[PDB]
Design a protein around this nucleic acid. Structure first.
Ligand SMILES: [Mg+2]
Ligand SMILES: [Mg+2]
Ligand SMILES: [Mg+2]
Ligand SMILES: [Mg+2]
Ligand SMILES: [Mg+2]
Ligand SMILES: [Mg+2]
Ligand SMILES: [Mg+2]
Ligand SMILES: [Mg+2]
Ligand SMILES: [Mg+2]
Ligand SMILES: [Mg+2]
Ligand SMILES: [Mg+2]
Ligand SMILES: [Mg+2]
Ligand SMILES: [Mg+2]
Ligand SMILES: [Mg+2]
Ligand SMILES: [Mg+2]
Ligand SMILES: [Mg+2]
Ligand SMILES: [Mg+2]
Ligand SMILES: [Mg+2]
Ligand SMILES: [Mg+2]
Ligand SMILES: [Mg+2]
Ligand SMILES: [Mg+2]
Ligand SMILES: [Mg+2]
Ligand SMILES: [Mg+2]
Ligand SMILES: [Mg+2]
Ligand SMILES: [Mn+2]
Ligand SMILES: [Mn+2]
Ligand SMILES: [Mn+2]
Ligand SMILES: [Mn+2]
Ligand SMILES: [Mn+2]
Ligand SMILES: [Mn+2]
Ligand SMILES: [Mn+2]
Ligand SMILES: [Mn+2]
Ligand SMILES: [Mn+2]
Ligand SMILES: [Mn+2]
Ligand SMILES: [Mn+2]
Ligand SMILES: [Mn+2]
Ligand SMILES: [Mn+2]
Ligand SMILES: [Mn+2]
Ligand SMILES: [Mn+2]
Ligand SMILES: [Mn+2]
Ligand SMILES: [Mn+2]
Ligand SMILES: [Mn+2]
Ligand SMILES: [Mn+2]
Ligand SMILES: [Mn+2]
Ligand SMILES: [Mn+2]
Ligand SMILES: [Mn+2]
Ligand SMILES: [Mn+2]
Ligand SMILES: [Mn+2]
Ligand SMILES: [Mn+2]
Ligand SMILES: [Mn+2]
Ligand SMILES: [Mn+2]
Ligand SMILES: [Mn+2]
Ligand SMILES: [Mn+2]
Ligand SMILES: [Mn+2]
Ligand SMILES: [Mn+2]
Ligand SMILES: [Mn+2]
Ligand SMILES: [Mn+2]
Ligand SMILES: [Mn+2]
Ligand SMILES: [Mn+2]
Ligand SMILES: [Mn+2]
Ligand SMILES: [Mn+2]
Ligand SMILES: [Mn+2]
Ligand SMILES: [Mn+2]
Ligand SMILES: [Mn+2]
Ligand SMILES: [Mn+2]
Ligand SMILES: [Mn+2]
Ligand SMILES: [Mn+2]
Ligand SMILES: [Mn+2]
Ligand SMILES: [Mn+2]
Ligand SMILES: [Mn+2]
Ligand SMILES: [Mn+2]
Ligand SMILES: [Mn+2]
Ligand SMILES: [Mn+2]
Ligand SMILES: [Mn+2]
Ligand SMILES: [Mn+2]
Ligand SMILES: [Mn+2]
Ligand SMILES: [Mn+2]
Ligand SMILES: [Mn+2]
Ligand SMILES: [Mn+2]
Ligand SMILES: [Mn+2]
Ligand SMILES: [Mn+2]
Ligand SMILES: [Mn+2]
Ligand SMILES: [Mn+2]
Ligand SMILES: [Mn+2]
Ligand SMILES: [Mn+2]
Ligand SMILES: [Mn+2]
Ligand SMILES: [Mn+2]
Lengths: 43, 44, 112, 119
RNA sequence: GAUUAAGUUAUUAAGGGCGCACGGUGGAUGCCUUGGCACUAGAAGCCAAUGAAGGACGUUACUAACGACGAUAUGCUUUGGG
RNA sequence: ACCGAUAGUGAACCAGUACCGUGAGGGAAAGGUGAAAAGCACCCCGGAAGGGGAGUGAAAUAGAACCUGAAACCGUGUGCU
RNA sequence: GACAAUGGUAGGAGAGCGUUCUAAGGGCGUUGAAGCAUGAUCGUAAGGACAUGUGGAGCGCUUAGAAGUGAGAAUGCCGGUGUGAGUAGCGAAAGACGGGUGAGAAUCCCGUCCACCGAUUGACUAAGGUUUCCAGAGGAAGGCUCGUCCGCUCUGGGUUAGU
RNA sequence: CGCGAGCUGGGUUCAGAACGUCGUGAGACAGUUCGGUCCCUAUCCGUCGUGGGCGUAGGAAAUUUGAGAGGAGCUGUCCUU
RNA sequence: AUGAUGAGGUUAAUAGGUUCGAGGUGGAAGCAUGGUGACAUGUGGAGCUGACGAAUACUAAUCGAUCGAAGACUUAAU
């Protein structure tokens, strides 16, 4: 099986609308001044 | 599986060496043809 | 005024870098360095070093305070692709495109 | 009750971890190995905490070999440490004594790194 | 009460489309020519055991490649030109 | 009243060379900063790469992969939808 | 001025548009040529101007000459870039942690444990290959990931016979 | 003669081989016999599952009506009368 | 599969551990004994026990961030 028609620009991008990545869930380290992921070590 | 061309220094130097080319009139025609074309390398 | 910096011919291919920038784009600068440091993709350290440079030029060449700075824009553009191949079955070999990204970014003050 | 690879390999890897940690009070690993290995190393510290020769033979049935850690200039064996200090550390304490802390992703493969220390 | 009822409409854009701006890639186009191509007029039309053709290896402060030269090597002499 | 870099010799670039074949043999691609190298002292982020200022230059939005820089194709912004 | 005729494939006829070169004439051009871009511009068509932007040095117009004179299709030839798609794949196999090093480590160095072949995955040599061997540096590309690492890169150095 | 990008491949349609038969022959079938490479990573529709977006004129939480749609729908023997 | 559903997130039994237990196996180790021994018996339904059931905050569900209303017009009805 091979595509019978090429994918459209507009088509291809409509498909890509669920392809983002998540903004990380990120608590601020107290007093250390860096930042880190939720429920992770403060390094 | 054994692919063709198993290298041999002797067998390649004989049969395709400057000498063996010299040995027949045709070989000289060969070196002539190559010398005409200007190949950097003639006989092996 | 509103300073920028660029990283030309970064080895990472543009679709990927765009996945990161899109998180970065528009946010306040501080937040951006955080998000950048916390995302786990290659482009994250690269874009990091680039936003740092841009902040540097902005403090140093334009005398603005860094804190109020904002990421006005950031984007990656196609840059020339290194062209390779991998050998395949039955002696055919098919192409591989190792493409590259130019990463621009621009920080900001007000209109003036 | 997790995996990574095949059961023999998981057994071995799990001894290899728990024999360590005891050597080294804290380690860094995947979150996954850490969860699986918290239980192993805890069951060992209860085994040493018992003290009888029987328990000793069961531990040594699980624990990996000589690892004679250099203390203040001497060589406690591995299990010899386990029954010898670790057990005398946690005796007034209940069982339940091990912790895992989340490092965040590692570069090469993205694996979630975490640290696991017994205290 | 916007309350009850009956009816009528709207805002939303995850994303998309048309238009526009600004960039990137790519190397068309224009311009250019050291290289070719077809001929004219005249010289010349052979070289070789007194070892050619064509090469290999060398030769400079540094030297890989090309040319140039050869253990007298990145040249020696000589008569002229400059 | 021939070509002007896909043309004209295969070859305007160290071409019968890269490369392919045991061999005879087959055989490419690849020209252009500027008038002058004046080829970006210096500062800055960076391990470098690269980059923003400061500069040379008529021009570097002529910066070396360098005249012009089309179309495909990739993107950021959005007026209407 | 009335009056007629004007669908059209193979094809016949006719009249034209535009390209490059040439002749002569008349001009334009660093106070900016061509080319490229953008525009609501004019002609019955091919097509012609014009303004702005870019560019930075060559061009038009008139008449006549002559043509390597007009592309959308040849599974056409060469170049670029897509689509498929963040998809298939990453080439037989056990690895774990500690300590280094570094800008940066699952991947390099050390260590410990673990495991694997053992008529061999060991040891030696003929072919064949020709600097891949060694030491110090390096990390853009090569390595199917990463790389401080290498059969990769730079500099230096390595092969000794009367038997 | 539903269904080989779902499976098989025994029949029949290649190359080897043999018998009968025909042809002088090379060969051939109106015949028989033993043997004999089944490729494809699903783009669109379709179909089975399964989430997001907006809508449903405030924002939510639980309970619901059922327009519609789907499923099931088979049958013996024996006792009694 | 992922996401979705559901149980929990310290004012907490959500998992791990811990301590009991069901089920499972079938008589641990060490020691004593009897044997020339291979072994047998005893101490002893012993010891061990992944998912199953209880109790217990011993370890980890920490800090925190994001999203989410202010209720259109018309006409008839108090
Ligand atoms: Mg010989
Ligand atoms: Mg000879
Ligand atoms: Mg890389
Ligand atoms: Mg082939
Ligand atoms: Mg796996
Ligand atoms: Mg209503
Ligand atoms: Mg609303
Ligand atoms: Mg929109
Ligand atoms: Mg429209
Ligand atoms: Mg000429
Ligand atoms: Mg051949
Ligand atoms: Mg014209
Ligand atoms: Mg003009
Ligand atoms: Mg790097
Ligand atoms: Mg061997
Ligand atoms: Mg590298
Ligand atoms: Mg078969
Ligand atoms: Mg058979
Ligand atoms: Mg098959
Ligand atoms: Mg998700
Ligand atoms: Mg419970
Ligand atoms: Mg339980
Ligand atoms: Mg329970
Ligand atoms: Mg209001
Ligand atoms: Mn998109
Ligand atoms: Mn040749
Ligand atoms: Mn030789
Ligand atoms: Mn092959
Ligand atoms: Mn086994
Ligand atoms: Mn959006
Ligand atoms: Mn858009
Ligand atoms: Mn003559
Ligand atoms: Mn003679
Ligand atoms: Mn010569
Ligand atoms: Mn030479
Ligand atoms: Mn002189
Ligand atoms: Mn050109
Ligand atoms: Mn070869
Ligand atoms: Mn020049
Ligand atoms: Mn620095
Ligand atoms: Mn620099
Ligand atoms: Mn200047
Ligand atoms: Mn280019
Ligand atoms: Mn020029
Ligand atoms: Mn240019
Ligand atoms: Mn363009
Ligand atoms: Mn757009
Ligand atoms: Mn007509
Ligand atoms: Mn008509
Ligand atoms: Mn005609
Ligand atoms: Mn012209
Ligand atoms: Mn126009
Ligand atoms: Mn003009
Ligand atoms: Mn033509
Ligand atoms: Mn075409
Ligand atoms: Mn092509
Ligand atoms: Mn994916
Ligand atoms: Mn992947
Ligand atoms: Mn797919
Ligand atoms: Mn898949
Ligand atoms: Mn895969
Ligand atoms: Mn492999
Ligand atoms: Mn390590
Ligand atoms: Mn360090
Ligand atoms: Mn090692
Ligand atoms: Mn073995
Ligand atoms: Mn064997
Ligand atoms: Mn040899
Ligand atoms: Mn080789
Ligand atoms: Mn080496
Ligand atoms: Mn790599
Ligand atoms: Mn059929
Ligand atoms: Mn068959
Ligand atoms: Mn058959
Ligand atoms: Mn055939
Ligand atoms: Mn007969
Ligand atoms: Mn839904
Ligand atoms: Mn409501
Ligand atoms: Mn219901
Ligand atoms: Mn119904
Ligand atoms: Mn019914
Ligand atoms: Mn439990
Ligand atoms: Mn006895
Ligand atoms: Mn309680
Ligand atoms: Mn909270
Ligand atoms: Mn209301
Ligand atoms: Mn109304």
């Amino acid at each position: 099986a091979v595509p019978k028609r090429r994918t459209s620009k507009t088509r291809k991008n409509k498909r890509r609308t669920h392809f983002k990545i998540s903004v990380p869930g990120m608590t601020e380290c107290p007093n250390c001044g860096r930042e880190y992921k939720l429920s992770h070590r403060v390094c | 599986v054994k692919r063709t061309y198993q290298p041999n220094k002797r067998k390649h130097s004989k049969v395709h060496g400057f000498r063996k080319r010299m040995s027949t009139k045709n070989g000289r025609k060969v070196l002539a043809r190559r010398r005409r074309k200007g190949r950097k390398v003639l006989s092996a | 005024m509103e300073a920028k910096a660029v990283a030309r011919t970064i080895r990472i291919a543009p679709r990927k870098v765009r996945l990161v920038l899109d998180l970065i784009r528009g946010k306040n600068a501080a937040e951006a360095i955080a998000i950048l440091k916390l995302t786990n993709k290659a482009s994250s350290p690269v874009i990091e070093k680039v936003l740092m440079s841009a902040l540097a030029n902005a403090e140093h060449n334009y005398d603005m305070n860094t804190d109020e700075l904002v990421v006005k824009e950031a984007y990656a553009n196609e840059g020339p692709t290194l062209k390779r191949f991998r050998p395949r079955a039955q002696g055919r070999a098919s192409a591989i495109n190792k493409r590259t990204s130019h990463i621009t970014i621009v920080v900001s003050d007000g209109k003036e | 009750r997790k995996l990574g690879r095949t059961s023999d390999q998981r057994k071995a890897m799990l001894r290899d971890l728990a024999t360590s940690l005891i050597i080294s009070e804290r380690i860094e690993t995947t979150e996954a190995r850490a969860k699986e290995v918290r239980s192993v190393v805890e069951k060992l510290i209860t085994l040493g905490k018992k003290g009888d020769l029987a328990s000793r033979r069961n531990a040594a049935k699980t624990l990996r070999n000589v690892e004679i850690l250099n203390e203040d200039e001497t060589t406690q064996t591995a299990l010899q440490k386990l029954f010898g200090e670790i057990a005398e550390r946690y005796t007034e304490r209940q069982g339940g004594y091990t912790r895992i802390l989340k490092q965040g992703p590692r570069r090469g493969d993205g694996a979630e790194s975490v640290i696991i220390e017994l205290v």
